[PDB]
Design an enzyme around this catalytic site. Structure first.
Site, mmCIF file in Angstrom:
data_model
loop_
_atom_site.group_PDB
_atom_site.id
_atom_site.type_symbol
_atom_site.label_atom_id
_atom_site.label_comp_id
_atom_site.label_asym_id
_atom_site.label_seq_id
_atom_site.Cartn_x
_atom_site.Cartn_y
_atom_site.Cartn_z
ATOM 1 N N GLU A 194 0.806 -1.207 0.000
ATOM 2 C CA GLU A 194 0.000 0.000 0.000
ATOM 3 C C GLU A 194 0.849 1.271 0.000
ATOM 4 O O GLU A 194 0.665 2.101 0.826
ATOM 5 C CB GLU A 194 -1.052 -0.011 1.118
ATOM 6 C CG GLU A 194 -2.049 -1.156 1.022
ATOM 7 C CD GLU A 194 -3.158 -1.109 2.081
ATOM 8 O OE1 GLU A 194 -3.097 -0.240 2.914
ATOM 9 O OE2 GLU A 194 -4.069 -1.935 2.096
ATOM 10 N N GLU A 315 -5.523 -8.483 -0.381
ATOM 11 C CA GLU A 315 -6.192 -8.186 0.883
ATOM 12 C C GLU A 315 -7.650 -7.982 0.510
ATOM 13 O O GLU A 315 -7.969 -7.016 -0.189
ATOM 14 C CB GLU A 315 -5.659 -6.952 1.603
ATOM 15 C CG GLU A 315 -4.212 -7.035 2.088
ATOM 16 C CD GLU A 315 -3.803 -5.827 2.984
ATOM 17 O OE1 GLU A 315 -4.701 -5.151 3.561
ATOM 18 O OE2 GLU A 315 -2.564 -5.566 3.112
#
Length: 524
Positions: A194, A315
């Site tokens: 991320e 995720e």
């Protein structure tokens, strides 16, 4: 008026087994107190504020493999779920993780502050323990590079350590630590976690990350040309995604995207709306996956890449940021509605099987998890059962197309844009997999149907194009009168699968707020 047609001759793609993958982060009780035993200094204790002796239950030795792993947790992940792959060591944790802290004799391992979520990390569980755990679990390792504080040189040394087969310092170091010659041969690696997020250590703009990741991808492949690399995307629909894919598509094999449902700002006092906010959430992911599919093909055109590029949805899950917090180790106890969200998630991946090659439930133990442990036992959360059912019955087949007519939800969605930009979500939601038994060549059709409606039941004619359907159908049903019902200690099977066999008459009734997996025979 509801209707479901299934087209077994209109193939989408084989279902990748890695849709059923897992994820472990060094956060809360995921590792220490999860796959490994608790100590008087597991999270939430620490070596300088330990648990009192009077209040500490130890994990019985019976429950541990010789390497120190929980055998009951292993039983769930390997024997029940058959998890094929696990992402590690995390999402946010990895951006300030130094992998060299976590190898070598255990007494020489450096304790570090844990910056992402606020703890301390002992690094007793580091690369070699993770691989050894994967070996017992029969799971393929999937390792994330530190692209926060980490350097390119650290990343090249990690690959050499894991996969080097020559006479070189870091490969020799691995041999010294493991007492064996053979490489770990980690096939899958991700270029950062991320890097787009404002919470991330080392956050970058899209153009700065993509330029750096192109260089890292190029150099990493020189160390081990056979590796599968995963670029860091955002959600699949964002500007970040286009910029990164345009720069990485000739250097990596997959593109990583993340999304959680039940997540984000909204007026939580409007309780009547939380049901619909939660259960229809996965519509946001299918819209985003479809956009990402086009960005992939744009980037492949632009760089004349003939190889297919796939998506790692590495995720996904259900997470309300006001329930699972850094203070409580992201612990969230799930209800039956959450399990309908989970079933909707897995139906997305089936329908998008032509591009989703990996999906990782965040997280596999204790963190926002299908599985909760105590020192002496464990229980399976509501969301465990859709995962179990998809993993057992929708794997090892070909996802086929369906055509579904269904009433739509007029209420508020989360994110709110799904209602306006995608459209009103359908109450019913389905996916189908054609399965051939390898020993007998018997053909079956597995049809997974979520009824997301909070109040309406639907009688649905189901037609299978060009196929005779066998007389008997096997039904795996998940349903509870109370959508707020949860599993917990002493109530482990409050929400559990009921199975039965019925006569097929070409229609089925899908109760309000339910999930039903139908197994139909196809006689030749």
């Amino acid at each position: 008026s509801p209707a479901l047609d299934v087209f077994p001759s209109a193939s989408i793609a084989p279902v990748s087994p890695y849709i059923f993958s897992g994820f472990l982060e060094h956060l809360g009780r995921c590792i220490y107190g999860g796959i490994l035993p608790a100590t008087r200094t597991t999270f939430p204790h620490t070596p300088r504020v330990p648990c009192p002796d009077a209040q500490f239950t130890e994990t019985p030795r019976e429950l541990l493999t010789p390497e120190g792993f929980r055998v009951d947790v292993l039983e769930v992940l390997r024997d029940e779920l058959r998890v094929p792959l696990v992402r590690w060591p995390g999402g946010n944790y990895v951006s300030s993780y130094n992998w060299k802290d976590g190898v070598g004799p255990k007494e020489a391992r450096k304790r570090r502050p844990e910056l992402a979520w606020g703890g301390e990390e002992s690094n007793v569980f580091g690369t070699d323990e993770f691989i050894a755990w994967c070996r017992v679990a029969k799971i393929e390792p999937y390792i994330v590079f530190n692209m926060g504080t980490g350097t390119l040189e650290d990343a090249l040394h990690w690959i050499e350590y894991c996969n080097g087969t020559g006479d070189t310092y870091y490969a020799n170091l691995r041999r010294q630590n493991t007492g064996r010659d053979e490489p770990h041969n980690v096939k899958y690696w991700a270029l950062g976690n991320e890097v787009w997020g404002e919470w991330q250590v080392g956050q970058q703009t899209a153009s700065a990350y993509a330029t750096k990741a192109r260089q890292w991808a190029h150099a990493i492949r020189l160390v081990d040309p056979s590796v599968v690399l995963v670029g860091c995307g955002e959600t699949g629909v964002d500007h970040w995604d286009g910029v990164v894919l345009d720069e990485l598509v000739d250097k990596v094999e997959l593109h990583s995207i993340h999304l959680y449902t039940g997540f984000g700002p909204r007026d939580r006092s409007q309780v009547d709306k939380e049901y619909g906010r939660g259960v229809y959430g996965p519509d946001a992911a299918e819209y985003s996956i479809e956009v990402c599919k086009g960005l992939i093909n744009k980037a492949r055109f632009a760089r004349n890449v003939s190889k297919p590029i796939k998506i790692a949805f590495d995720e996904y899950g259900v997470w309300d940021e006001t329930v699972g917090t850094p203070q409580n180790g992201l612990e969230q106890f799930y209800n039956f509605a959450d399990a309908l969200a989970m079933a909707s998630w897995l139906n997305v991946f089936i329908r998008q099987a032509d591009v989703v090659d990996i999906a990782c439930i965040a997280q596999s133990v204790n963190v926002i998890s299908p599985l909760i442990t105590s020192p002496t036992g464990l229980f399976r959360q509501t969301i465990y059962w859709p995962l179990y059912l998809f993993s057992r019955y929708m794997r090892d087949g070909i996802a086929v197309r369906v055509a579904l007519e269904s009433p739509t939800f007029a209420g508020e969605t989360l994110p709110q844009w799904i209602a306006s930009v995608k459209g009103r979500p359908k109450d019913l939601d389905a996916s189908a997999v054609l399965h051939v038994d390898p020993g007998t060549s018997a053909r079956s059709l597995r049809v997974a149907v979520v009824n997301r409606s909070e109040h309406a039941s639907y009688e649905v004619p189901i037609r299978i194009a060009f196929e005779r359907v066998g007389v008997q159908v096997e039904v795996h049903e998940l349903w509870h009168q109370d959508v707020h019902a949860r599993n917990g200690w002493g109530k482990e099977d409050e929400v559990s699968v009921k199975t039965r066999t019925e006569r097929w008459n070409g229609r089925w009734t899908f109760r309000e707020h339910s999930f039903t997996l139908l197994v139909l025979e196809l006689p030749q």
